[PDB]
């Protein structure tokens, strides 16, 4: 029952079975490397990946910096035996952790079942292995055997934290996306992880720790395993399908590369960035590719290069693709079994669902970009357990994701140099001097990943304007509700945990297996250092003004952004002028503790203010200082912000106003069926049901647009407010500490100040503020949805209803002969149904108790 049923040490002797030197497909001539078979069809190679790609043999930083927020290099990592032993144990521990969850047990079983298809012949009737889905296993006597395998975990390439799933290609076959599948090579390290900021959780967890949290490497590995799952079943989305962004405006990222395959794999809100028209195209496409496999098995009359029988191999693929087989031996794809399998691989196996099973803190979206790299070590039980990861039960790390908090659990996280420099990739944003005064421009650099995600309109497609023929055939969809924990359990119960495919004997391949990694689209660098001359101070200027670097002078707060940007000893605050005065005053040692007491009260009071309002649709609270914290709406003052918000609604928050384009909806054409009452009536019922679906389709589309175009904007402001609050705490702490350090050693001894206590209390206050800010911003996001996007859908939908009503009434009259005895009842039904809107229910489209309880 454990996934890894053997203890593996790097220096264990080879046995040619599960501990051996192996060779993998290669462009040139690789030497054998020591590897471990930790489970049927899965090997681990504790080596840096200098093998799989011949253009990637050097382990040093590259000439051109990778265009990624966090990268890390160390040519000496994983070069010693002890590191390789620790690497191996880390990976096996992580597999056990994944396997210990119902969801991971199901994913790993799917991976073992997902043998690459035997499509290596070009003969129409022959089953044959593809050799790049194999390895050579050297035996203790120095001979070798060849074996099929599904999955290899290997150490990273030069960028130690670039984790990804690689595989060898085919001259004609695109194995990862044509339904065949291919052996997957994951570059992965258990020895490092990412740090991310998170503030969404403060309401459920008000004592959430300060600073960065670490991603649990189990989540990270599970993410790569999910890609490996798609690719083994040949249903990966082509990497030329990317979510393209606008990059022209000053506030927009210079560039961003996020694949559809990535959005899918993340799940949650991110996967909903992809509209139904594209979703359904994919699903129909993979369905047809599975049908071709079934067909190819029906045409197969022989098998070569193994003693395994044709019956055995056909059966392996029956099970892999969950094909149906009739009593005559003929394979087919059942639509319902396919939809289940495809839904499990693409919607059940997601990062977001793994996070739910691990009960860990994790980024909620790919747009919550990693901010740091940490050295970790998960092998010792005192650091990390298979059931609890870092959050060890019955310790202070059990609650509030404390185990993942890199400041609280600092013995487990060593922060490394990020080799992406802070302004390696940036835009230069300059307030024209004359705006401030002729005086010099106020120009600041802004890190690429601090800018706004603005998705290209090309990403959102629909066929809403497309007419539709309605027939007596109901052609009516089922509900298809969102992946619940109960649904997952029901997949779990179905699941085949019985009989993995066997390790069969195949004939020996050549000593060097020739292979080239799958051809990838080339990616153009995005431009860098682009300069914008602006006629206003931006949120980026307001935020930068709140920062300070290393120095000797006493920092002073100022209510002037301009003063702060110009003087490294001056820091902008949106707090009151009384706070400025109180925090900046020379304070004698006898009044120090009273002064800190007051500042913490004032800091809390200022950051906890909430105004209530009845004058805004779907917004019942306002946090006024967001106005001057970030120059929202370019009004410098809170009164200006509260009023502006009442006057214009949630739109004043946005850096850009989305297009939400809903065309005239395609009209329904009804097939007539003279001489048949039941079919004519069915056609009227079908019209009305499809009209109900039409409202649902428009709403679902609008939500996708809103999630991607609007909610993302609000999320970033939410993150900048947390940064702004942190900046105020750090500045206030630096000033208080400077004052303390002016005192004599007698006064300090008497006072016995603990700056850690102050940090804690301020962090507590920041959490309380963020509870209010998150609730507020949530309201704004949903209000904007409710009041500025959805009504465009509603108007078009009511237009459609009105037209349909006329169509259906004409149809009843034109068929009143046939309908004789049924004309009046159908009139009422048509009239009733089409006289009232189908209410928008947000809960129907998005699952997040955060955005839903606003509704």
């Amino acid at each position: 029952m454990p996934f890894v049923n053997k203890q593996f040490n790097y220096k264990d002797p080879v046995n040619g079975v599960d501990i051996a030197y192996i060779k993998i497909p290669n462009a040139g001539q690789m030497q054998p490397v020591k590897a471990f078979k930790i489970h049927n069809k899965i090997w681990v190679i504790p080596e840096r990946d200098t093998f799989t790609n011949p253009e990637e043999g050097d382990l040093n930083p590259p000439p051109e910096a990778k265009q990624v927020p966090v990268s890390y290099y160390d040519s000496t990592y994983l070069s010693t035996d002890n590191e390789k032993d620790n690497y191996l144990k880390g990976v096996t521990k992580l597999f056990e952790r994944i396997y210990s969850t119902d969801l991971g047990r199901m994913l790993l079983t799917s991976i073992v079942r997902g043998i690459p298809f035997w499509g290596g012949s070009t003969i129409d009737t022959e089953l044959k292995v593809i050799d790049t889905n194999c390895i050579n296993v050297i035996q203790p006597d120095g001979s070798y055997r060849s074996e099929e395998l599904n999955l290899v975990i290997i150490g990273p390439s030069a960028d130690i934290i670039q984790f990804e799933c690689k595989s060898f290609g085919h001259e004609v076959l695109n194995l990862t996306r044509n339904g065949y599948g291919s052996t997957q090579y994951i570059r992965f390290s258990p020895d490092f992880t990412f740090g991310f900021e998170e503030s969404l959780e403060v309401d459920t967890n008000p004592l959430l720790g300060a600073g960065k949290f670490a991603t649990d490497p189990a989540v990270t590995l599970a993410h790569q395993l999910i890609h490996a799952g798609h690719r083994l079943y040949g249903i990966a989305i082509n990497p030329n399908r990317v979510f393209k962004v606008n990059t022209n405006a000053y506030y927009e990222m210079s560039g961003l590369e996020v694949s559809f395959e990535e959005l899918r794999t993340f799940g949650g809100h991110d996967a909903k960035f992809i509209d139904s028209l594209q979703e359904n195209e994919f699903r129909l496409y993979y369905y047809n590719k599975f049908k071709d496999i079934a067909s190819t098995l029906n045409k197969a009359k022989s098998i070569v290069g193994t003693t395994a029988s044709l019956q055995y191999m056909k059966n392996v693929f029956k099970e892999k693709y969950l094909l149906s087989e009739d009593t005559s031996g003929k394979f087919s794809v059942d639509k319902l079994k396919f939809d289940k399998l495809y839904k499990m691989l693409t919607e059940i196996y997601t990062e977001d669902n793994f996070v739910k099973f691990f009960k860990v803190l994790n980024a909620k979206t790919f747009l919550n970009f990693d901010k740091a790299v940490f050295k970790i070590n998960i092998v010792p039980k005192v650091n990390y357990t298979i059931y609890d990861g870092f959050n060890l039960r019955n310790t202070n790390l059990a609650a509030n994701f404390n185990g993942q908090n890199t400041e609280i659990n600092n013995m487990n996280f060593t922060k490394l140099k990020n080799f992406t420099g802070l302004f390696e990739f940036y835009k230069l944003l300059c307030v024209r001097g004359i705006i401030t005064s002729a005086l010099n421009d106020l120009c600041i650099k802004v890190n690429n990943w601090d800018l706004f995600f603005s998705p290209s309109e090309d990403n959102f497609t629909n066929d809403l304007n497309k007419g539709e023929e309605i027939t007596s055939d109901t052609n009516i969809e089922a509900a298809e509700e969102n992946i619940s924990l109960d649904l997952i359990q029901q997949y779990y119960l179905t699941f085949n945990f019985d009989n993995e495919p066997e390790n069969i004997s195949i004939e020996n391949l050549s000593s060097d297996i020739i292979g080239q990694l799958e051809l990838m689209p080339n990616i153009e660098r995005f431009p860098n250092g682009k300069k914008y001359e602006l006629d206003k101070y931006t949120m980026f200027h307001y935020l930068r003004a709140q920062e300070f670097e290393h120095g000797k002078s006493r920092i002073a707060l100022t209510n002037s952004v301009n003063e702060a940007l110009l003087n490294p000893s001056r820091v902008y605050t949106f707090f009151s002028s009384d706070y400025v005065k109180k925090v900046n005053k020379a304070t004698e040692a006898a009044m120090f503790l009273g002064w800190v007491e007051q500042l913490v009260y004032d800091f809390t009071d200022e950051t906890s203010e909430v105004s209530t309002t009845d004058k805004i649709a779907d917004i019942t609270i306002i946090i006024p200082y967001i106005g001057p914290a970030l120059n929202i709406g370019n009004m410098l003052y809170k009164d200006d912000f509260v009023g502006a918000l009442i006057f214009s609604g949630a739109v004043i928050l946005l850096e850009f106003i989305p297009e939400i384009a809903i065309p005239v909806l395609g009209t329904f054409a009804l097939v007539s069926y003279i001489a048949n009452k039941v079919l004519t009536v069915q056609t009227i019922d079908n019209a009305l049901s499809k009209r109900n679906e039409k409202w649902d389709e428009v709403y679902k589309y609008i939500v996708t647009n809103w999630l991607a175009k609007v909610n993302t904007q609000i999320d970033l402001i939410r993150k900048k407010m947390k940064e702004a609050l942190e900046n105020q705490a750090e500045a206030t702490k630096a000033i208080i500490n400077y004052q303390y350090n002016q005192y004599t050693e007698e006064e300090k001894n008497n006072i016995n100040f603990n700056i850690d206590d102050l940090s804690s209390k301020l962090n507590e206050s920041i959490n309380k503020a963020m509870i209010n800010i998150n609730k507020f911003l949530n309201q704004c996001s949903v209000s904007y949805l409710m009041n500025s996007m959805i009504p465009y859908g509603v108007k078009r939908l009511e237009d459609f209803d009105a037209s349909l009503k006329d169509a259906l009434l004409k149809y009843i009259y034109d068929n009143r002969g046939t309908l004789i005895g049924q004309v009046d009842r159908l009139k009422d039904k048509v009239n009733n149904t089409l006289s009232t809107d189908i209410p928008f229910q947000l809960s129907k489209y998005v699952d997040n108790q955060r955005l839903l309880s606003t509704f």
Partner: nanobody
Amino acid sequence: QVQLVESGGGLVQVGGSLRLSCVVSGSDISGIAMGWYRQAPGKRREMVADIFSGGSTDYAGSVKGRFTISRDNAKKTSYLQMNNVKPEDTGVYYCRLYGSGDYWGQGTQVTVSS
């Protein structure tokens, strides 16, 4: 009901160019992928090019750079431009609509001649 009708094809000189065409009737092709396949005698039918509704494409490795696939949602058509044709290209070509059924064109011969 759904019909795919191909046109074009025939004999072509090595190194030459040839365009195959297909028109879909009985269905819109908006939101549905399409593709071209080929099958040489005794051999398994293989995908040659794919094109998704939004225009993105995929190619068999060995035709990339020589073949281009295109579609027109408004006209419900697909075409396969074949340049620098090689003896390996000879066979029966088929257009496909990746819809809820088995939607294939009739099959059209392309013979590459030296």
